Design a protein around this nucleic acid. Structure first.
Ligand SMILES: [Mg+2]
Ligand SMILES: [Mg+2]
Ligand SMILES: [Mg+2]
Ligand SMILES: [Mg+2]
Ligand SMILES: [Mg+2]
Ligand SMILES: [Mg+2]
Ligand SMILES: [Mg+2]
Ligand SMILES: [Mg+2]
Ligand SMILES: [Mg+2]
Ligand SMILES: [Mg+2]
Ligand SMILES: [Mg+2]
Ligand SMILES: [Mg+2]
Ligand SMILES: [Mg+2]
Ligand SMILES: [Mg+2]
Ligand SMILES: [Mg+2]
Ligand SMILES: [Mg+2]
Ligand SMILES: [Mg+2]
Ligand SMILES: [Mg+2]
Ligand SMILES: [Mg+2]
Lengths: 124, 193, 99, 148, 52
RNA sequence: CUUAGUAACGGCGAGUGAAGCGGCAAAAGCUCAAAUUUGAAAUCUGGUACCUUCGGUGCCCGAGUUGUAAUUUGGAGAGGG
RNA sequence: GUUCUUUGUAAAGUGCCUUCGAAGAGUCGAGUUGUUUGGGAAUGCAGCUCUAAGUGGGUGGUAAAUUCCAUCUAAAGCUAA
RNA sequence: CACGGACCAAGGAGUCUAACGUCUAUGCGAGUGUUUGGGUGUAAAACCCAUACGCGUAAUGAAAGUGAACGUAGGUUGGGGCCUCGCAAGAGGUGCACAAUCGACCGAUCCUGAUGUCUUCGGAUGGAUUUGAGUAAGAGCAUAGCUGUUGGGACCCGAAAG
RNA sequence: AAAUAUGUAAGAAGUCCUUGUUACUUAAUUGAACGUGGACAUUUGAAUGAAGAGCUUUUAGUGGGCCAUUUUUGGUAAGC
């Protein structure tokens, strides 16, 4: 996210470091201010490129990053949150684990009786 | 039968289902024939449009009652208000619906103007059959589009009375909930001397 | 009743100005009329009472109107028609026999 | 396509990758969901706890329409104004002219209060609100209005 | 008018031409610049000489 | 198309299972009964002559008041003024 | 599109004010038995027993009593896409 | 000294579909999906497209309901990479993902009952070896392919029966 | 009361000083648990070794076994 870049630049000392992301960069509509800065990445969304240039910044390709900074200096690498993905909710499903079943339709009468309560036999 | 950690599926195919499969191969042709029907129909009828002029209606339910949408026909009040007979209306491309009624004013106001506009922008020929030239416009619905009524304005001042909204919506429930229980007290306490 | 203007409450809805249109004729279907009154009045005196209606006036005359309803509910289908029929039989006893 | 499938590789190998001892027989364990309380009860406890039994009240002739109430947080809130008009109202605001935000016309039933808005007066028209979301709009300068 | 540029719109409801993951198609032009060459340490010897 | 493998049914097990709203294709409305023509059965099949023959005109039987035409169908409507 | 034919003291529509407004029964509905439905103190259908009303009648997906409110007009019928 | 095989040619067996899991590739990205239909066409192709509808952006509770910042979106311990000093060895500064740990917030349950109050409605404040498929600077949607799952004649041939 | 087989320890996530935090604990700011600051470094605390250490997802076949040295129960014994 473009906010996740901003929170990395609020850090002490890291005002003027060319942030680097090997992946997509996405826009956010939950921030009403955003600093200047120079981002370097594979891809930008139409909204993220627009938000960076509107704040007087510059979107840079990874080959231009190599020309400006050959040994990689004054740089700050960022990585998106891997476990946030929905697939890993389900990994490790067993008893007393708190892990979500693989299930299409929800609501009561879709896995809430004999197994998830005292009143119906036992809890897990 | 059951194995692994997969989800529980419900695929209904224990009946003789392969006897009743339909595959829409005709999709591409039915379009062309459906377009031939519209070109045929516009010949034999000639300068008239392909559709009747419909009214504006407000949709039902708590979900959709923001929208405005085309209804079936006008109403024997709305046909008369514009100044024409229910029998004569149908003959000039208007849809008259007998079974709707009018409880709302803001729509009734719209529908009269909607007819008033239409009634001005046509050319009714005499039965003699001299026929002055004109050429058809296929869609009335295109010519008289259903406008979407912008209710509120953009820039306004800030009024503050101070009952917190959330307090209103809780007292609204709390009053509703305890009506009959207070009626039962008020009716007994009044009659008991 | 008048709508309040909020999403929940006793009079739930939105304030809009009304029309109150003309009343339909189809709503007045049950209504009697003079031709039916004379007709139904003239057919009753010819035909006379049925077999259960010779036991129905005897249960009012002897026992009472609680016992009469119980039979008229079992003879007819429903409790609301058994109210009516018993009331019709308190006029057949009143108008004919006494006066 | 068929030329990438593993049945091409098994050509010339007797058992087709199914085994000599066990083999591939018709429906060994049972068809479908059979023996879920008997000979498959370990798979159904872990993976599907809760399955058997029943719980709450019934509801005859329910309607997905009566329960339509799609929520909106205070984070989004400003996204309901068009993008050209957005910077005008943000920079230099006052009580004379605030923007009206019709949330029902945009398609939302309730205004929840998830996290933080800029200090600018607004007007919010909504069917429902929560207690906390009303406090933040008051705090900034704006108000709420109830409708149907 | 039909495909669009940075100047004119597009004539397709919600469309713009796609961007590049690399600005310069030529690689060896980048490597033989200067800013790289200063940072690059000296070369080896193509194909080795077999000791022992 | 969607609602929806959903609300519900079911040794509540295996299994089964629609409907309103919304978007589209297509759009077209109407007819008897129940009323005194009563200052004139105003209606009708057939037969028998003639004609401009998917039928028209004139006689004669017959059907029909235990009701054939006209007027009206609830969105109304009719008699009176 | 062109040129001979006028059926009519015939037929139809609308404004205003009164007195009126005919509306389908061994049916609706109820009990019981069988079947059927997703329809659960009974979704439809059919047998037998009972059997209405006219400010009435049906409907308002939990049985019943009492009071309200809304919506339709059943037990007769035709009709392209 | 268990069963099939005298010989030769041709045929002869894990398929297609509806709905799904993990992994991979491509498009766009808080959105995404043109093909129900319309427009157009060199006519089953290609091209364009309005509104809705899914799935996602919020959970929780049998329900009525209620609905996610005490703080630089917290502290603590690790932590790639970067910056400062240094000839190097090393020392400080800040530290994205991810891992362990003590707290706050949302809904359920149990407990406390403040200003008020159509005298029985309202539920402020503060908790508790409880409880969730939750929040805490969003990650999904469509299409495509291997392997796996269930219904189907379901890898091919085989009953006694009804 | 053996032999063979078996649990734990041989340090940095450590040791020592300095005096903070608490609704727990004490007659007592005494203790307890986690801390700030300071002191202690590659003989950093037995041997030998280390084609790296750790973590996740997913899926096949299998669920008739048999033999040999020593210990052994049933049985007179057995290719039991
Ligand atoms: Mg092999
Ligand atoms: Mg072989
Ligand atoms: Mg097997
Ligand atoms: Mg779904
Ligand atoms: Mg059933
Ligand atoms: Mg049943
Ligand atoms: Mg069935
Ligand atoms: Mg009728
Ligand atoms: Mg019956
Ligand atoms: Mg059945
Ligand atoms: Mg028919
Ligand atoms: Mg054999
Ligand atoms: Mg042989
Ligand atoms: Mg061959
Ligand atoms: Mg299959
Ligand atoms: Mg066979
Ligand atoms: Mg049998
Ligand atoms: Mg076994
Ligand atoms: Mg075996």
């Amino acid at each position: 996210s473009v906010s996740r870049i901003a929170r990395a630049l609020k850090q002490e000392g890291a005002a003027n470091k060319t942030v680097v992301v090997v992946g997509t960069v996405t826009d956010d509509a939950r921030i009403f201010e955003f600093p200047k800065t120079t981002v370097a990445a594979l891809r930008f969304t139409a909204g993220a490129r627009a938000k960076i240039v509107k704040a007087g910044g510059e979107c840079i390709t990874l080959d231009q990053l190599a020309v400006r900074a050959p040994k990689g200096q004054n740089t700050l690498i960022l990585r998106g949150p891997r476990n946030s993905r929905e697939a890993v909710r389900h990994f490790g499903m067993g008893p007393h684990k708190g892990k979500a079943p693989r299930i299409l339709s929800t609501g009561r009468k879709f896995e809430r009786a004999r197994g998830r309560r005292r009143s119906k036999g036992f809890k897990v | 039968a059951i194995s692994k950690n997969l989800p529980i599926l419900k695929n209904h195919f224990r009946k003789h289902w392969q006897e009743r499969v339909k595959v829409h191969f005709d999709q591409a042709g039915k379009k062309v024939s459906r377009r031939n029907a519209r070109a045929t129909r516009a010949a034999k009828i000639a300068p008239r449009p392909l559709d009747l002029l419909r009214p504006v209606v407000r949709a039902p339910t708590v979900k959709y009652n923001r929208k405005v949408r085309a209804g079936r026909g006008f109403t024997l009040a709305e046909v008369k208000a514009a100044g024409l007979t229910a029998a004569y209306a149908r003959t000039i491309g208007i849809a008259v619906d007998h079974r709707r009624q009018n409880r709302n004013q803001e729509i009734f106001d719209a529908n009269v103007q909607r007819l008033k506009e239409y009634q001005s922008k046509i050319i009714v020929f005499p039965r003699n059959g001299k026929a002055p030239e004109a050429e058809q416009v296929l869609s009335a619905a295109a010519t008289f589009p259903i406008a979407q009524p912008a209710t509120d304005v953009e820039a306004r001042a800030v009024q503050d009375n101070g009952e917190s909204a959330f307090r209103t919506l809780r007292l609204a429930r709390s009053e509703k909930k305890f009506r009959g229980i207070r009626e039962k007290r008020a009716r007994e306490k009044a009659e008991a001397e | 009743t008048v709508k309040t203007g909020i999403a929940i409450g006793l009079n739930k809805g939105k304030k809009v100005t009304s029309m109150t249109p003309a009343p339909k004729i189809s709503y007045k279907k049950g209504a009697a009329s003079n031709r039916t009154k004379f007709v139904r009045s003239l057919v009753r005196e010819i035909a006379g009472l049925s077999p259960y209606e010779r036991r129905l006036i005897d249960l009012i005359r002897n026992s009472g109107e609680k016992r009469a309803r119980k039979v008229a509910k079992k003879r007819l289908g429903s409790f609301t028609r058994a109210k009516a029929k018993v009331e019709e039989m308190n006029n057949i006893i009143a108008a004919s026999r006494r006066h | 396509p068929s030329r990438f499938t593993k049945t091409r590789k098994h050509r010339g190998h007797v058992s087709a990758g199914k085994g000599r001892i066990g083999k591939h027989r018709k429906h060994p364990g049972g068809r479908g969901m059979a023996g879920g309380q008997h000979h498959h009860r370990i798979n159904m406890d872990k993976y599907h706890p809760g399955y058997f039994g029943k719980v709450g009240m019934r509801y005859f002739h329910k309607q997905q329409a009566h329960f339509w109430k799609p929520v909106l947080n205070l984070d989004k809130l400003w996204t309901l104004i068009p993008e050209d008009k957005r910077d005008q109202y943000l920079k230099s605001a006052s009580k004379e002219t605030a923007p009206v935000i019709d949330t029902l016309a945009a398609g939302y039933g309730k205004i929840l209060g998830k996290g933080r808005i800029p200090n600018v007066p607004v007007i919010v028209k909504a069917r429902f609100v929560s207690k906390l979301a009303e406090e933040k709009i008051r705090a900034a300068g704006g108000v709420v209005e109830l409708i149907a | 008018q039909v495909w669009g540029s940075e100047t004119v719109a597009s004539s397709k409801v919600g469309y713009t031409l796609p961007s590049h993951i690399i600005s310069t198609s030529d690689v060896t032009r980048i490597i033989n610049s200067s800013e790289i060459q200063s940072a690059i340490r000296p070369a080896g010897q193509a194909t080795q000489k077999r000791t022992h």
